[PDB]
Symmetry: C3
Subunit: 285 residues, 3 copies
Amino acid sequence: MLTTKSLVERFELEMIAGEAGLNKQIKNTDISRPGLEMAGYFSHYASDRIQLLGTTELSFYNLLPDEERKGRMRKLCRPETPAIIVTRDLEPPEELIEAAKEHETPLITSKIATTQLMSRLTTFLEHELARTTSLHGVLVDVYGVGVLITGDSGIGKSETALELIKRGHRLVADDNVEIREISKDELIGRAPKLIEHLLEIRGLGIINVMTLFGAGSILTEKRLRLNIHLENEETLRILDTEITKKTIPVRPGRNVAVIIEVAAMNYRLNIMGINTAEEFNDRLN
Amino acid sequence: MLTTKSLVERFELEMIAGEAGLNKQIKNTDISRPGLEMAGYFSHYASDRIQLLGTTELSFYNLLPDEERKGRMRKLCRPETPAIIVTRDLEPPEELIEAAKEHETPLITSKIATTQLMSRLTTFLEHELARTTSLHGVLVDVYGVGVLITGDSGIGKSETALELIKRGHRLVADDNVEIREISKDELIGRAPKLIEHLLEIRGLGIINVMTLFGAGSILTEKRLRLNIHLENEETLRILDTEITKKTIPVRPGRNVAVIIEVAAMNYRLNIMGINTAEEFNDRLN
Amino acid sequence: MLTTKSLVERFELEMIAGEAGLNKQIKNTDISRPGLEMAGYFSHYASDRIQLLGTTELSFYNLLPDEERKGRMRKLCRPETPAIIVTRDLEPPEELIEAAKEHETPLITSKIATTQLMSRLTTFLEHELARTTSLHGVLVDVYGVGVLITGDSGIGKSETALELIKRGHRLVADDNVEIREISKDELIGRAPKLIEHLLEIRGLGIINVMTLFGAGSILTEKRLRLNIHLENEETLRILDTEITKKTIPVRPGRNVAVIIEVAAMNYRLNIMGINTAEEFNDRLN
């Protein structure tokens, strides 16, 4: 499971005490700012979240009489609390360091503004606790657009991806695609480490695009944005997010790769708010 | 209908008199030089044509005695006569200006040589009185050759045109093509103003080539020269003119766009008088 | 048949005597260095081969007493012997010149080292006595790889070759290919002089690639290395040599020309000792 040790490693956080508590789990992405706790109000809710002590919390705490503040830092270090981070380069109170050691609660110092750090921490947490799955298809980057090509076996997915590569686009994954929903509506795809840089074509066998075309033809990971479904305003649902989908009929008399290129171009255009299907719908009136 | 007003507007002709006659119709493209009329010989034939008075006509007229010339300019201004143009920057006779006002015959002065003006006027007239029709297919400019792509629905006409556009060629019209036979064997095609710059592709929908590819990918009008008929020394007759036609079978294992490009190249070559089908026919002997 | 006259012409060899013997046949590619003959030992074996007299032979011959050497040069000039070449710019013995004239044995002087000349002569001989045949298919040079495209009629061989030409590759022969096995595992292909530079495409007819695309699109001859068999570690046997073969299925949804390009690239890679099918076979373990 995800533990504070992973957090400290990703951001190279400065540990001050509570090293024995680095094996504590971080169950959610939510973050807590225990201001009310500084005033003596404690509760179970949010106790298992990372706690951030910034100017708001410490400016109040430091105005407390010693007899009133007594035990509040200790009560903050509950067993389930994965970490307490003193932000804005503030000095952690001696009582807190003491409590962190006694209760083995990871205590960290950060020089970052509280709000900014909170955003960075939660983003990492969402990335780590990302729902994951795998999909059959080919992931390619076309004009900066992550395109997932799907369709029945033999339809020409890998052959079309090869032509796209030949045309200057990048391969991310062939056959199987590992997908991670690292945040709301953000799907990141990558090839299994085993078939990285590989593309298999009936008749030719397995080829290495990196070896054949160089570094400019590959990309380790890419956010999915467009599903091109090859077949003999729709969408494709993957996990909890839906991405634009275009179903292109395959028949002689056309270059599927070109269609995909234009679909990616049209997509970026639509993203800018420009939609030709509407432009004409109005021109008709 | 076509009236003298349209003529004066197109060439910004200098009107001297007969403004009330600008609503007179110009029925044909033929032009008249009334020399015999200067000698007193009048007839119905050609009276409804634009009349040009150049050096030949006026040098004779100006040698006439006043009593003999009397009424000849008036008899020139017949009701059906749409316009009288004094060319070569010559001075229109007072009698002519007078007659033009009395009979409301548009009187124009031009500084151009009679023969040259005649050619320019008739060319405009043929353009205006051009026979017109519409055709299903896609018109593209490939290596300067106006190519009309035809073939059954779904064969891949628009998809192939899109690939040609992607390859640097220009789109003139998708789906419907307005054709004008502006002169003998000269067919000009253009897209209906409604679908200008548009191309529709099954699966993607309607796209704007101008927005997607820029100005270098479009062309307002183009003379048709080659018909590429996609199918699962021939010609295609359109109105009163026949254009070269090549029937290309569509099947996997080939890039139709490339075939079209070569067909256009071969066409220009044939135009230069070079024909490979003959070159080999001789090499065989 | 192959005669000494052809040999002298190809290398512009310096004839010293025996012109009347230039019509003698050169039956094999083997070459003889008659050292033992200098010592008086003669035999039928190798007598019908070109004979080379270098330092080894002449340094021994010149040490012989006149009575012992008598007749040895004459016995060297057997009727079937097509030619005797004195290499290393050595002086042919008077007795040899005399014998060559008497027996009409072509006598040549060469300034080249014996071993080097032997290699050059035999190479020419193998080229000349090359087994020959003709094959249906299209020969193109793709990234320096001689690719023979085969497959049933209508599959798209010539159309695919045309696309390859359009993509910068070179045409060697369309329809029929003249093959010459000029040495072990070395097959050279060329188009019949009659259809040189020509390519025929259904619908367009016969075109001249040289006229249409210029000199950079043609190649007179090319060694075959890869067979791409279009179909709706294998090899293709031609004469006595086998060349790598890849069978590519043709179906919509793919650009066959691109597949061929990658196959040629993969081939050069495999030649360098790099095989991706193995790279992955190991990565799986």
